[PDB]
Amino acid sequence: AVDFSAHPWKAPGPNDSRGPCPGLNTLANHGFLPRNGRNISVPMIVKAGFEGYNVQSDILILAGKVGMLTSREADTISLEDLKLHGTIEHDASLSREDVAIGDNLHFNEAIFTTLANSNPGADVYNISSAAQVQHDRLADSVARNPNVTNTDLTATIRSSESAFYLTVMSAGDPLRGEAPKKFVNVFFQEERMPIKEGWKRSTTPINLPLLGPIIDRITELSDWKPTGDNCGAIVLGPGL
Amino acid sequence: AVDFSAHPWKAPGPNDSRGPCPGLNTLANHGFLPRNGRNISVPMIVKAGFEGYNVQSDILILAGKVGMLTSREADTISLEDLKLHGTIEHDASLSREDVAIGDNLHFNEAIFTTLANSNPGADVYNISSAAQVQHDRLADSVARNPNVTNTDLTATIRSSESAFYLTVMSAGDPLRGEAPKKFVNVFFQEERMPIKEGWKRSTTPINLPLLGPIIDRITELSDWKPTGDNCGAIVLGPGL
């Protein structure tokens, strides 16, 4: 029971904190999280993710508390803090550049081209297109970034993020692992819920049981292999 | 402001949650944290560690948020949750057994013997004794624990914990990196502030600048070296 008319999209202003995550950015841009993107807690993320997307607490508590590590504060972050490389933020993003060779924070259209051009001849993105995109994005990083980090952990996060856009921006049952291109494109390009375009919050809860087989299938189809030491160590706090 | 006389030691009851950390347990046993050891946030830890020990927010925010990962809750833990092996809890503890070959949670006198017998002929523990104890405890784990984990991360946490007992249970300036045996022994064995015995909260702030060189010196004197997997990966949540 949520009124989205009470949660209009507004462009972030100059001092509004935004991060590398289109999911949290979009929530902020609709006031499900504070529009200023600051002093955000895990409880706020849980509630916002539920209200906006029908994403459940299981994934948001797990991801949320890892994200809290990126700030210097006891129990909040600014959305921009999440750019901290090697906590959650990773190389071979769908819409951002690798931190060693560019901007790991802002939407980048040239990077997004690979996703935007995926699944030619359908009007949806799906599990096989998502996997191909992941394969191609990793190949790009391996080719152009000598400092690329690619581990079981980064690969899992990446597949989770692909599963997120397929499910949250779905038309049908998020189970189907497919989302209209016109919805997903608005999500990434404008960090807006495509309400005008016909999108509605899922009526099916999106949780780890639902996401898990989608994640695993994306990974499997992506023809993935580790790089280097394959160490799943995260950065535990900023400025260590 | 803070009145220690209003914070008497009381033994935990059977349903009071206690963890592998004598620092947090002691605070709970004095009501600086909830005596039941539950529903504890990073802000609560920050305030309790300041009031009880003069430990500053820098280290408590960093450690606190890593510890939050051990629970299934959005922003709190039970003290017992911190026993989760491979988040913070590690092998070659000073006063607990390795989880693969015993109890990683409760104080164990036989394990503590090594610490208790360190620095023979002085009435203090100090940086060189702390280092010897760490060397000997790791040797014990390598000898007796087929599942031993020893990484740069576990070694650093271990030196941090040793620096904690040398500083928080100090008589003089915590700078000196030495603490009376009679204070440290009560701290570990009873998880009590040794007020009766003459201990007072440090009047010098204990923060990362103060602890850093003590930690590094303990590590250096401990003659530590990597032994296998040196991947400093933490466990990101329970039930994975």
Ligand code: HEM
């Ligand atoms: C609530 C639903 C969520 C959705 C739908 C979502 C969606 C996404 C998507 C699609 C990406 C990939 C962007 C890209 O590769 O360019 C992403 C990245 C990210 N998300 Fe989320 N997210 C959500 C929740 C969260 C939470 C709770 C956190 C942390 C508290 C988080 C932190 C991040 C971070 C740090 C990245 C950067 C990874 C990278 O691309 O390097 N997200 N998110």
Ligand code: HEM
């Ligand atoms: C955020 C705050 C804290 C958290 C989350 C935390 C957590 C932990 C955990 C999980 C352990 C078990 C490590 C192991 O031995 O396997 C531990 C050990 C320890 N902690 Fe804490 N701690 C905190 C603050 C403090 C403080 C303020 C002190 C001050 C005295 C302290 C002193 C110790 C000591 C001495 C040990 C070693 C126990 C042993 O090796 O037997 N801790 N801590």
Ligand SMILES: C[C@]12CC[C@H]3[C@@H](CCC4=CC(=O)CC[C@@]43C)[C@@H]1CC[C@@H]2O
């Ligand atoms: C929550 C998270 C995305 C989802 C990941 C999680 C790591 C563990 C994990 C394993 C799986 O098999 C499913 C996805 C999950 C549940 C990641 C840690 C940080 C990241 O944002």
Ligand SMILES: C[C@]12CC[C@H]3[C@@H](CCC4=CC(=O)CC[C@@]43C)[C@@H]1CC[C@@H]2O
């Ligand atoms: C906070 C912490 C103790 C202090 C550690 C920190 C890891 C990084 C670190 C490196 C140092 O050189 C000093 C101690 C510190 C700052 C640890 C992570 C978990 C543990 O409780």
Ligand SMILES: *[C@@H]1O[C@H](CO)[C@@H](O)[C@H](O)[C@H]1NC(C)=O
């Ligand atoms: C994705 O769509 C393409 C084209 O419509 C199709 O060939 C492919 O089999 C689909 N994959 C999945 C997983 O449904």
Ligand SMILES: *[C@@H]1O[C@H](CO)[C@@H](O)[C@H](O)[C@H]1NC(C)=O
């Ligand atoms: C935990 O603490 C919060 C914050 O004070 C409170 O609202 C809540 O009721 C508590 N939960 C339990 C289980 O007591």
Ligand SMILES: *[C@@H]1O[C@H](CO)[C@@H](O)[C@H](O)[C@H]1NC(C)=O
């Ligand atoms: C620790 O105490 C012993 C015995 O008093 C002494 O010989 C040693 O030098 C001390 N070490 C440090 C670092 O103070």
Ligand SMILES: *[C@@H]1O[C@H](CO)[C@@H](O)[C@H](O)[C@H]1NC(C)=O
């Ligand atoms: C611990 O070591 C034993 C002996 O090598 C091995 O059989 C077992 O799988 C290990 N356990 C874990 C937790 O890996």
Ligand SMILES: [Mg+2]
């Ligand atoms: Mg990235």
Ligand SMILES: [Mg+2]
């Ligand atoms: Mg231990």
